[PDB]
Design a protein around this ligand. Sequence first.
Ligand SMILES: Nc1ncnc2c1ncn2[C@@H]1O[C@H](COP(=O)(O)OP(=O)(O)OP(=O)(O)O)[C@@H](O)[C@H]1O
Ligand SMILES: Nc1ncnc2c1ncn2[C@@H]1O[C@H](COP(=O)(O)OP(=O)(O)OP(=O)(O)O)[C@@H](O)[C@H]1O
Ligand SMILES: Nc1ncnc2c1ncn2[C@@H]1O[C@H](COP(=O)(O)OP(=O)(O)OP(=O)(O)O)[C@@H](O)[C@H]1O
Ligand SMILES: [Mg+2]
Ligand SMILES: [Mg+2]
Ligand SMILES: [Mg+2]
Lengths: 478, 383, 380, 434, 104, 52, 114
Amino acid sequence: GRVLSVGDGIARVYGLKSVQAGELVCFDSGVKGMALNLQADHVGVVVFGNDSVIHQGDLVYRTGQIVNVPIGPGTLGRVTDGLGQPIDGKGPLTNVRSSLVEVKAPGIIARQSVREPLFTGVKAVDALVPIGRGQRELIIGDRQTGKTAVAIDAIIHQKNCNEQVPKAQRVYCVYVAVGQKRSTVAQLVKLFTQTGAMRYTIMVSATASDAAPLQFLAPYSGCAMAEYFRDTGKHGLIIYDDLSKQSVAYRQMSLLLRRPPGREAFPGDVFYLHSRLLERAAKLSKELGGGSLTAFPVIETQAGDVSAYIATNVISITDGQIFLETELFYKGIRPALNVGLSVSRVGSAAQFPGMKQVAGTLKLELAQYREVAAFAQFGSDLDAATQYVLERGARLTEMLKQKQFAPIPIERQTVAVYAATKGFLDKVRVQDIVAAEEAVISQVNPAVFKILKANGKITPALDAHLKAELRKVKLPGA
Amino acid sequence: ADAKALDELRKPKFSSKYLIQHVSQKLIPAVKEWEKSYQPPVIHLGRVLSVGDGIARVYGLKSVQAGELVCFDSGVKGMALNLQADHVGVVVFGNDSVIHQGDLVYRTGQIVNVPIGPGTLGRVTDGLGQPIDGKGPLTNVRSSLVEVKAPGIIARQSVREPLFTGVKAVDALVPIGRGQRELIIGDRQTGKTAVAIDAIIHQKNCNEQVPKAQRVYCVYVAVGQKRSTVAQLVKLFTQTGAMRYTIMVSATASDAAPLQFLAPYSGCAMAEYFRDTGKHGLIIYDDLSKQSVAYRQMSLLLRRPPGREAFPGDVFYLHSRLLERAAKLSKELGGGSLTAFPVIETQAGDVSAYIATNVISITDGQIFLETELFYKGIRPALN
Amino acid sequence: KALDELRKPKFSSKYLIQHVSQKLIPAVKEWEKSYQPPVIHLGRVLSVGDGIARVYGLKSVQAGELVCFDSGVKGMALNLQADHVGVVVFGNDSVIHQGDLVYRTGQIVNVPIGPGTLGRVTDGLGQPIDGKGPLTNVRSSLVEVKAPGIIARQSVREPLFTGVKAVDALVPIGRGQRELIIGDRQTGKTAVAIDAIIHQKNCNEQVPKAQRVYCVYVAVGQKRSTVAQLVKLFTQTGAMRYTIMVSATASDAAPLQFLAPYSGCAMAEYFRDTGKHGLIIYDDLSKQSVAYRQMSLLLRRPPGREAFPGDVFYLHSRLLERAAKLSKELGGGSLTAFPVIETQAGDVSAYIATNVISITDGQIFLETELFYKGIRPALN
Amino acid sequence: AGYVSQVIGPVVDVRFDGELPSILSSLEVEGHSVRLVLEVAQHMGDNTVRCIAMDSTDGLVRGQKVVDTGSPIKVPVGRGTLGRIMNVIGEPVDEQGPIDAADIWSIHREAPEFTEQSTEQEILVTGIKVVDLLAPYQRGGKIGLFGGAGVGKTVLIMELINNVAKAHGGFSVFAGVGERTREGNDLYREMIESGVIKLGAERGNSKCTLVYGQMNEPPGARARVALTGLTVAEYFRDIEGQDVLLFVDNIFRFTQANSEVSALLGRIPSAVGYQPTLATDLGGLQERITTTTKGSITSVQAVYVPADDLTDPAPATTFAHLDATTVLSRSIAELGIYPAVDPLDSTSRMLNPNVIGAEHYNVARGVQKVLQDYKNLQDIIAILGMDELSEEDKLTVARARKIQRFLSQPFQVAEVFTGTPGKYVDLADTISGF
Amino acid sequence: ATDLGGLQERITTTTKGSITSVQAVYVPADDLTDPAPATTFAHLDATTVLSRSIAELGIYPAVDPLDSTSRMLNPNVIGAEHYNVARGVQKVLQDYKNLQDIIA
Amino acid sequence: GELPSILSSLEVEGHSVRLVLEVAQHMGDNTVRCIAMDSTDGLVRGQKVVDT
Amino acid sequence: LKLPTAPLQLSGTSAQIATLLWQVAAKENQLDKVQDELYQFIELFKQHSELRRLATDPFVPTLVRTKIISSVLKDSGASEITKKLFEALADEGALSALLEVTVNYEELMLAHKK
Ligand SMILES: Nc1ncnc2c1ncn2[C@@H]1O[C@H](COP(=O)(O)OP(=O)(O)OP(=O)(O)O)[C@@H](O)[C@H]1O
Ligand SMILES: Nc1ncnc2c1ncn2[C@@H]1O[C@H](COP(=O)(O)OP(=O)(O)OP(=O)(O)O)[C@@H](O)[C@H]1O
Ligand SMILES: Nc1ncnc2c1ncn2[C@@H]1O[C@H](COP(=O)(O)OP(=O)(O)OP(=O)(O)O)[C@@H](O)[C@H]1O
Ligand SMILES: [Mg+2]
Ligand SMILES: [Mg+2]
Ligand SMILES: [Mg+2]
């Protein structure tokens, strides 16, 4: 094929008459392409790289193949670009196999219900908005909330669980970094190395200097690298960091392929852009292996405005929602989870049974905390039980705070919400409930955490032993 | 149809010429019998393809420069904005109701220029330099371009001389340097014009007490105003004597939006005469927020994509390349200055508007005039 | 090179091949016979889609003239352009293919008006949909009629009683004015309209024949079950002895929903023009506005605010100014319009709501907060 | 000499094989039901002009002959138009014969140039006390009327007509731009009833020319009818030498009509939704309303504010041209005060001591301050008590209570149904009285 | 509107049988003024509107009692003992909402 | 013949000042689309442009 | 009325004319006759300036332009497909399409000679 015109990362190509839609093509400059809109007179080819090396009249060869990435266990540990190619300087991907990036999601008969829990290690999530394996959960928030920090804590925590579970139920994580800085993702490879999570992590990095078709296609490349573990009976965890930056990369190609703009400028098919991708996160049936893929799309809002175009699409696609608020972030509540707006549609089906019976009371009390504090900040009057619910809900709000990169396993999370909901953290001052609960985990016997890990549930022979052990602790303030 | 395949058709490949010679003996007599219906062909002149919305498309004009005064045969000036491969899009400095399809367009050979000099001092002109006060043509004057680039970094010095306005609030609180740019921003009817008029009258009072080089020659550019307002202002400047030192450029509300877009550049070219020859100029663009509206009209009639509020996107560049010519020159360039007073009307005190925050990030300061101080009688209502 | 000026061509016609084709193929020695595409009173569908047919030819069609396709389905010649006609289809365009023959009917859009329309449920074009035979005692009339002038009218003096206490006490309505029943969804707008029609049935049996008032309900964009429930209530009340119903439902084509208020106004202008008194109710003029916006965006007319055309004000003002009270030298008859405009969360700042507020005389604003406070009719 | 090529709504393309008509020129479609006048909007190229119709285009065939009149829309002007109703193109719609034309003038015109303008900036005495004192009218200025329904707007219109014809001997034009036909007929019959319009043989003693472009007319006809009223007023200014009154009824409907014809010609809309040429399409009308050396036109334009939003671009563009506002209030009219001019919300640019003098300025500012001082203690009287505060506060209560009465005035056109004879009040008597 | 209407007008009880339709309608940002729910509001005999505010209180099913309407709420259809208790419950829930801005 | 690459610098001969044009796009018919680094007032439609 | 089928399919509005001009030249076996009829008009535009003015100038009247081509394509060199093509292309002012209707005619011709 001959290049008719070229500019802005689009090359209109004469000829190429047998080219397929979505097929990889190769320019004679070595830079690749993808035939996106086949027209009667030309082909519209989005260019995988810098379009300064393409000239008018250059030769375009079709590769014959739709766009594909190398999948397999040889991608584990490596940092690749938007299509497979590793950018960490460690040679080729050994022990790997190519497969298409646009695979049809498993249908109705290929699934089963989401029942196993996915522990993130964030107790504001693992108590109130719990996440099952095969569930897609939106981490939506404003500009610099804790959105990545929720998702990095879900990845680091899988390293802590993979050492303790058998080989079959290990979760292999994939972090797709779309439109970010290249040094921002270099800070995450350094964090995943010195924690050790890079043994189980693939990083698909389409940074801000990559071409707009490399950032549009990198969530699909990362989903294809993570669908390897779903299709072969293992468990995957995919995190698409800023799907709101993938859709801006999609809007750029759609406006330069002269597809007519819609809302804000976005193409019409931008719902189909994300629902094609998030529906690939599934819990498969046991005939297909019982494998699983859990998605965490990240969407950035502008001023807490979830009524945007891309925001309302992904809210409509995903099961749950982890809504992070910038005003809760600065009040000290970090993770800044809006407990009144954050949902989980799987809900009590796939949470920890040891915390299903504790965090039912926790959201029942925090729902009562919210409306009474709207009244009592005026300073009218207080009622000695209305005084109880805004004093108890302050014990629970400080309980769900957390530090940056320390995911709490699942048993030390449910003992702490036990000690906060069974009254053991009343008359402890509110300033050091964040400081009392290290004593509630360290001074309480380390072998009571093993029973609640092995049972998975507070047995009657354990609450009478644990609440005997939550009394022999030296709490600060008191 | 490849251009590789359209390039081989330059070479003759007919292999039979039995109707090349048939029509080439018959073409000229058939063309000759229709000469009453041929308009004369046009190469270096222009012919109007289509006129509408104050933009004409002109066929021909093979050698026009971009940005050049063209003259329609009905005497209306234009400016060749975009030269295209097939036509020239010209922008009509006037009403387009007198331009027809098939009219002749004449190139003038010069980029859009206005008469500058000592002889425009005292006169009331339109947005392109033709006088409207009725006292004859501009004499003792010369032609200079309206889209001069502003002086660079090395051609300037910092402002040192103190440019008295005559307003106690301004000269005490918000004092004006002599090469400065000071925005007079306020609502409707908050005394924005009155500050600039007082500055012009005070320059008249100070020009007769200073020795010939510390004199300030004012320019008032009235864009989008009423013509009765401009007549009353010329009456005031005449009876105070301030019209001895003032040029008055007016593109009023009835005038075409190209003339309202161009009138601050015309007045700036007239005041840059005093900047460039060592003297000092004062220029007041009254309602630069109306020049922005006229430029938005021109841009949406040119089908350029609207941005914020509807504005073309280069509406910052419109005012920045205007106000950057208000400078204080160095001693190697004469030491002349030009002080600008852009005026921006604000809607209900909204300083966070588009054109308002554009001109705030161009000018060296602001003079905010509030309606709540103006209604109470605190006049000038300087915030 | 001296041939560079002809390198790329420029065309003044998208259908250039449609002109070259009718001059190249009859030039062969077989086809001088019998095969000439007729273009004066006939056409060929070039394009068809979404209820718009682009028709080649039809050189002598008039603007707004009713045309007919060869599959029987009718249409209106709405865009008349230099090389083609844009025809809005009065049915489903699935039966229309490229190359279909389009005949002009010679007439602008007509409607059967007269006393034979009383008791009948028609569609948006006047054809009966109640299955009681054709319209009997009628005659055809134009749908786009000029509204009466300044001197044809006289001042509104006579009251038109709606039977609603809130209206007839607080918002008094005269014979010949236009009152806008504006409100949110499910606030009682149709209830005020139906109570007015039923009360005119009650008043018509006790006043002389010169003072009876004959109702027309235009149902634009509603569902056929709602219209069937309304015909059932009008029959069980007895209001069908004086009421025409013009029903262009949701499944009907957008040009029919556009033309139903104009056809119902043409039916009610019979009673206005011959001395009697009319009551026209355009229920959901919002939906007629949406249908007209559909046809105009599909005809690629330049869109304005919210997507609407420039002449969407002219649409409703040209419709609603036909509700007048005539002068005594024109019979003294009258026509009273109740347009119904649905608001979205109760703003009268929406574009079509502002247009009809500018057109009509008064308004009856029904507030949804007053609805569940017990106040029914929920009149603000 | 030209033939119809495209008909898209109210927008007609006409093709001329000879030479094209000018932009704004009037074309007559030869052969139609009614007189169909088109106005040339642009030259599209390929010998096509793009026109905007002044009537309905339904029933128009491509190839219909179109005659160019060689000029813009031309309307009858003179004293023979007084007491008549015209549409936009000059036809009589009052059904009272033809119109006795003194001349036939083009409605399209440039504004009176800089040498012709008046620099004087003087006051138009209107004979109404609250209007002459607090919000005076500039002779040659534009005045926004913020009335409505039931505040006595039509009585104020007919009294400005009556008092200007009585005092200054000038005539009036009423341009009903886009008005409902019921309201236009009501104003017509109310003018016949009040004696400012006379029918039959006494037709020459009428003071008002009605120019009506109704709401059911196409957008091109509503967009140009204000120019027709302007042309009728400009004849009285430039030939008769009078102080004319023009009443543009709803200047916002003029704006909205020009916005519709700009949308129909395929132009990109500017801010909020308006035409890109909004300031110049408004200023082309308002700059022809001025004082020339011959006479003046004073324009009283009713202003509608779209979403109760004064920063909307149509009232923000109109308010640049206005020289006075007279806000008519319902609360003033429910104290039985007529005319219902709000004495505190009405403004004027003519209210400063450099055009009206310190005497008139200080009387007006004292009256306005006294009424304001009474206004911001009515939540102190109604809450704490009538005789609760001081005697000086009740002195301002009594003085403003009797000034608030004194602004009312009986009107001469209202005497045929109220009985009370109307009383013209001069300016110096108003100053010395207040 | 015509695509939605062409779908919705086939789901009818006819003289042959009947189709009782239960359609969920997503509103895009808890916004009932969006044209895709506002178009389909005119097609339904009974519109159950579920509100976010009712769901955050824990009242489940989160049916907005005031905003949910039906055409079966006439007293000559469901009797007066049903109609007046439904209207009384709605009036008590409405003037509670008018009090709720002053309780808070 | 032999178009400049995208981002290449082009010099306009005969301008009043030095006018550098940076190539932005290849338009398709032996035409490149350029961005002027200075003012284009004075460009005539035949002016010689030199690729660097 | 069904024509011969074209060898290869082409794009529109200049190659759509050539697809039909080929079809009414393969009906009378005039495929090689109208081809050099086309090539002679390519050459005639290189010679004559008043013939190319009937394809570039927008100010020539369409009455003139359709009556110069009709008044020189008579009594010699007609072929009645060439004579009716260039009077159809002069009606709509599409005589500038003569270069690319020729190029796409060859691409049908060269795929017809196999
Ligand atoms: N749980 C937490 N406790 C304390 N600090 C936190 C917590 N989570 C995040 N932070 C701090 O907040 C800052 C923002 O976190 P993060 O990088 O997750 O923002 P983000 O939501 O990803 O926004 P962006 O994508 O723009 O970076 C980080 O510097 C981090 O130090
Ligand atoms: N310093 C002052 N003292 C007294 N009166 C003043 C003063 N400045 C202005 N005024 C009066 O206020 C009115 C508004 O003044 P001015 O015309 O300067 O305002 P503006 O901002 O130009 O309004 P617009 O831009 O709408 O013309 C004038 O009528 C003037 O008489
Ligand atoms: N005066 C009334 N008293 C009691 N109920 C009423 C009254 N008016 C209306 N309703 C009830 O309100 C419901 C909605 O009313 P209606 O359909 O007449 O209004 P609408 O605005 O036309 O609704 P929609 O726009 O959905 O058609 C109906 O079920 C009706 O029974
Ligand atoms: Mg981040
Ligand atoms: Mg001013
Ligand atoms: Mg209804």
